[PDB]
Amino acid sequence: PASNLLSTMFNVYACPQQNACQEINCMWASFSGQVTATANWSFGKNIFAYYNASEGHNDSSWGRLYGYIYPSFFLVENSTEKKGVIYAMAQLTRVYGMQLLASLQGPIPYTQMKAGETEAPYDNEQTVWHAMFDDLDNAITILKSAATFGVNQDLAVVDQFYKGDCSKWLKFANTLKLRMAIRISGVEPEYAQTKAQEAVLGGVMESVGDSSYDTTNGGINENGYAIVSGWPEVRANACLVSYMNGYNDPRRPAYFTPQTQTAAGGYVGVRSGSAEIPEPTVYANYSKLFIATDKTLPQPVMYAAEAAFLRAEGALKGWNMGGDAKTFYEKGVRLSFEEFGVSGADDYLADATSIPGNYVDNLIAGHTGNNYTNQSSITIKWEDGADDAKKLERVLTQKWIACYPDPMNGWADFRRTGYPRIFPATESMNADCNTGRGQRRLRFTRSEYNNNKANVEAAVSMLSNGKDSNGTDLWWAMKENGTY
Ligand SMILES: [Cl-]
Ligand SMILES: [Cl-]
Numbered sequence: 099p100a101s102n103l104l105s106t107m108f109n110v111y112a113c114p115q116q117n118a119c120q121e122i123n124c125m126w127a128s129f130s131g132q133v134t135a136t137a138n139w140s141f142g143k144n145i146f147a148y149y150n151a152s153e154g155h156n157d158s159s160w161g162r163l164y165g166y167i168y169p170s171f172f173l174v175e176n177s178t179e180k181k182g183v184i185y186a187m188a189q190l191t192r193v194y195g196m197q198l199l200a201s202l203q204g205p206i207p208y209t210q211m212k213a214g215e216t217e218a219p220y221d222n223e224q225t226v227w228h229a230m231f232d233d234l235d236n237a238i239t240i241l242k243s244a245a246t247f248g249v250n251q252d253l254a255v256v257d258q259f260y261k262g263d264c265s266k267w268l269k270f271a272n273t274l275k276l277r278m279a280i281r282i283s284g285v286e287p288e289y290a291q292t293k294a295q296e297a298v299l300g301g302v303m304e305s306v307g308d309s310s311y312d313t314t315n316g317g318i319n320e321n322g323y324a325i326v327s328g329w330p331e332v333r334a335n336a337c338l339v340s341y342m343n344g345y346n347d348p349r350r351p352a353y354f355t356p357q358t359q360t361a362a363g364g365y366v367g368v369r370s371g372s373a374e375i376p377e378p379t380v381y382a383n384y385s386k387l388f389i390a391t392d393k394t395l396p397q398p399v400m401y402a403a404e405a406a407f408l409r410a411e412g413a414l415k416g417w418n419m420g421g422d423a424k425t426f427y428e429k430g431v432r433l434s435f436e437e438f439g440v441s442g443a444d445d446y447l448a449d450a451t452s453i454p455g456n457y458v459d460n461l462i463a464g465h466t467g468n469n470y471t472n473q474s475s476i477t478i479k480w481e482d483g484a485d486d487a488k489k490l491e492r493v494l495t496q497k498w499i500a501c502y503p504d505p506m507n508g509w510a511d512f513r514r515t516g517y518p519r520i521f522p523a524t525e526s527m528n529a530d531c532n533t534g535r536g537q538r539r540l541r542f543t544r545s546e547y548n549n550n551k552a553n554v555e556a557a558v559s560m561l562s563n564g565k566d567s568n569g570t571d572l573w574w575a576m577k578e579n580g581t582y
């Protein structure tokens with residue numbers, strides 16, 4: 099039954115299984131500034147945190163995401179004959195997984211893939227982004243019609259996200275469409291605008307009841323963060339915690355546990371890419387991710403707040419988003435508080451004085467080489483007269499705080515715009531990456547060089563600078579000279 103093949107594919111949304119969770123949510127994810135991997139895997143500083151991962155670590159994401167999406171996508175496509183809600187969901191789920199992988203490594207095979215064949219040619223990034231928008235539009239057309247009939251009973255049997263409600267999936271799909279549009283908006287401003295405006299007309303998420311969570315954690319009924327955190331190999335990141343400490347942010351107790359290393363209490367994150375080789379036992383009593391504290395908590399996929407912040411940015415760009423930037427900014431902040439059951443958004447949004455906090459690492463002796471001066475001075479209260487760069491940093495900083503824990507949002511927005519100002523490693527261990535800009539992408543995998551050699555070598559020439567490097571920019575990322 100085709101609907102049953104969707105269940106495996108659905109692991110791309112949140113990656114609940116403990117190793118999927120580590121690979122996607124707790125490794126390179128530290129480049130988004132919210133989580134820190136506290137382990138070194140006997141590699142010392144030759145790890146993601148210092149921009150010089152092993153081949154095995156680098157290649158994990160490809161294997162994980164490809165493993166969930168294929169061959170199930172083609173099996174569904176064939177069984178359904180490219181029609182119906184189950185096919186629409188297979189398309190949406192493939193796009194979700196592959197937009198993540200494209201946002202990691204750049205070119206991927208997509209348009210030219212055929213059922214069971216390894217040697218697929220790569221699409222360049224323009225081609226795969228456009229192809230993914232096309233498939234997503236097809237899914238949207240199907241879901242929009244399906245939604246008019248009420249909850250879909252085929253989809254209900256297997257859908258832990260929305261229990262078959264195609265109206266919720268339609269909002270999810272349009273919000274993804276808008277995320278994608280914003281992501282490619284630097285390199286293709288007019289194509290992006292068109293897609294974003296379509297997405298807004300289609301209908302994006304508007305309330306907390308619209309947010310997507312993997313409610314069963316992939317049928318495991320316990321989340322992967324709690325497992326990784328228990329090892330321990332993941333803690334709260336110095337960067338997000340420091341921004342939130344500076345803001346006296348009331349979401350702190352919903353996001354993190356207080357450190358218990360010393361009697362001081364308070365929230366203290368771990369510097370990713372620390373002065374000393376990261377050791378699990380050293381950081382065991384620093385702030386943990388709240389979601390790790392109760393294994394039954396469902397891993398998040400996408401929050402209603404993100405749709406508001408995407409529209410705020412679109413409004414800053416001069417796009418027609420159904421509202422102005424201020425309105426969407428404040429909406430986003432209030433949705434984020436609401437999502438986590440936190441009070442006090444009014445007085446938070448009135449804060450014109452508080453600035454992002456500096457980071458000190460005083461819990462363990464000899465750690466002051468981890469201390470960091472926050473390069474942001476952005477305040478919370480909306481200022482109609484601020485310059486463009488300040489309005490953007492304000493939007494993207496609150497967006498980044500709101501979309502938590504999200505492995506990619508921070509790193510993607512930083513690579514695209516320079517905001518939020520994610521704390522870099524103390525040093526780079528890669529000759530092609532500097533701490534100013536960090537790691538820019540993951541590389542193509544060893545398995546592809548070995549088994550799909552001619553096509554992966556061709557894909558190298560599709561990269562911005564023709565080099566399969568950690569420091570090579572993706573098509574949509576801001577380049578060294580500020581252009582796209
Ligand atoms: Cl394991
Ligand atoms: Cl370790």
Ligand SMILES: [Cl-]
Nearest residue numbers: 168169213214
């Ligand atoms: Cl396949």
Ligand SMILES: [Cl-]
Nearest residue numbers: 180181182240
């Ligand atoms: Cl159809």
Ligand SMILES: [Cl-]
Nearest residue numbers: 249250251252
């Ligand atoms: Cl039905």
Ligand SMILES: [Cl-]
Nearest residue numbers: 286287288289
């Ligand atoms: Cl364009």
Ligand SMILES: [Cl-]
Nearest residue numbers: 391392393394
């Ligand atoms: Cl628990």
Ligand SMILES: [Cl-]
Nearest residue numbers: 530567568569
């Ligand atoms: Cl490299």
